[PDB]
Chains A and B, each alone.
Chain A
Amino acid sequence: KILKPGKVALITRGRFAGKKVVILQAIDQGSKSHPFGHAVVAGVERYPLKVTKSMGAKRIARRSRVKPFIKVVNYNHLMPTRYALELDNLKGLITADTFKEPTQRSAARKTVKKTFEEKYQSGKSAWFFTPLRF
C-alpha cells in the first residue's frame, strides 16, 4: 500500500535505470498486458542543466529542456521515495489507449515535457528534476 498516484520513485531496472519517476497511475491489481505489480510511471531522461542569468534566453531554454519518458514497470523494479509530486495536468491523462496508440504516446510525452518545463520554470520539485548520482 506504499505506492500511490503522484508519489516520487526511482527505477532500478531497464535502460532508464536510476531515473526518478512519478507514479501517474497504479495498476497493482494486475493486468493481462502486465501480469505483475506494474504501474505507469513518467520520468526524466535528460535532467535540466544549470541556468546562468548571463547566458542567453535561448541557451537557458535549451539547458532547461528535459526529455521525459513514460513506461509501465513492475513494483519490484521501482523504488518508492518519501517525496511526492502532484500536478493537475498529470491526472486523467494516463489510459490504456494512450500507450496503445503511438500518436497518443507522443502527445502524452509532449504534454508531460510541457508540464515539467512549467514546473522547472516555477522552481518546484527541484530535487525530483535534479539528476541523482550513483
Chain B
Amino acid sequence: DTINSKLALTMKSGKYVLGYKSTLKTLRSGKAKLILIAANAPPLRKSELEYYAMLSRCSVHHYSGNNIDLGTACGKLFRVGVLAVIDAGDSDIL
C-alpha cells in the first residue's frame, strides 16, 4: 500500500513512463531509476527488462497484481504491464 501511494504521488510529482518501448528507451538512456513490471508480464519481456535493468543499474520492482491492477494503482484506465520511473519527485519511492 505504501509503495502504491508513493507511486501515485510520483505519477503527479516526478517523471514516469508507462510503456514497453518508452521504458526500453528510458532503460537504454539510463534515466529510468526504477522499473515496475507486473506479475502477468511475459517471461521473455520480464527477462529482457531485467537484463536491461541490470546493465543500466536500475531498481526492478515486481508488482503483485496484473497489468490491470498496475493500471488501476497508477490511476489510468489502460493496462500497463511495465512502467519506468526516472524521478520520484516529491514522493520517496526511490
Contact = CB atoms under 8 A, between A and B. Distances in A.
A and B in contact, CB less than 8 Å: yes
Interface of A: 1-3, 37, 75-76, 80, 82
B51 to A, nearest CB: 9
Contacts of B27: 2
B70 interface: no
B50 to A, nearest CB: 14
Contact of B55 (A37, A75, A76, A80): A80
B24 A1 contact: no
Interface in B1-54: 21, 24-25, 27-30, 52
Given A1-B56, A37-B25, 17 more contacts: A1-B29, A1-B30, A2-B27, A2-B28, A2-B30, A2-B52, A2-B55, A2-B56, A3-B28, A37-B28, A75-B28, A76-B21, A76-B24, A76-B25, A76-B28, A80-B55, A82-B55
Contacts of B30: 1-2
Contacts of B55: 2, 80, 82
B11 to A, nearest CB: 25
A75 B27 CA distance: 12
Contacts of A37: 25, 28
A37 B30 CA distance: 14
Nearest to A81: B55
Contacts of A2: 27-28, 30, 52, 55-56
A75 B21 CA distance: 12
Contacts of A75: 28
A80 B56 CA distance: 11
A100 B83 CA distance: 40
